[PDB]
């Protein structure tokens, strides 16, 4: 269902990051952000929501959901709260001693896994997206 | 052409803006970064890349783009280096600027706003950039 995210934190190096997964396509957005917080976690949600058809996103359900402000940025951007991973770890894993900050690494996480290939998830979620306009 | 973008940068409240539209459907990535540095942009230019299939970046190839780190990200990344968008996406900056706090806010806000607008029955940007890319795949 081509609307239909999937958003999960995971934790490197005392910092935290959200990782969203386009659930058709396993094409990933991830960011490191500063805190696991509501205001992060709104702001995440409306910058995934500006860049991709965002229906419905699946997440941990935990105390950063709860409050005033992603429900308000849920609300205004129409979405409704109703293995790609353990890869991200290895991934940054293979690269972290290229980069000086682990934001670096991460961004060059996202790159190798939504670019790898008989298509890349980068792929997979285009053809998605442009087969549910038609 | 499919892969090719254009990166500008908008100056607002004493904040950089940098924006990525991509030139055949008029879809914007845009950012508010701490400094118009190398650093900085070689960031941006590494995240646009991992989420759209960019081949070309056009830029206005001022001070930002000279050193190291924006020249190794593009390789990295496989890029070349080869007015009214940074306008309408101000207006519309202005429209919901005193429902967020922040600027960043805003400026996703209306990064949000621009890409959905339907206007007419007629395309959004984000339904052309898909279309576009899909096409040159298939
Ligand atoms: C391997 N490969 N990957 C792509 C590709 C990569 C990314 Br990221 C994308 C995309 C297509 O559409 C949305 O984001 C194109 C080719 N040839
Ligand atoms: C008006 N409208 N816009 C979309 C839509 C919006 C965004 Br953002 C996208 C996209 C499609 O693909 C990549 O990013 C779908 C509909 N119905
Ligand atoms: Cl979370
Ligand atoms: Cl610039
Ligand atoms: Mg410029």
Redesign the interface.
Known sequence: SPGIWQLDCTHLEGKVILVAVHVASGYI?AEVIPAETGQETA?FL??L?????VKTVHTDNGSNFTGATVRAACD??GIKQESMNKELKKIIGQVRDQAEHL??AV??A??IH??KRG?SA??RI??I???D?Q
């Open positions: 957005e702001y409306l910058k929501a500006g860049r991709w058809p205004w951007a934001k670096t961004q060059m996202v790159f939504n670019h298509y980068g792929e285009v053809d997206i442009a087969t306009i």
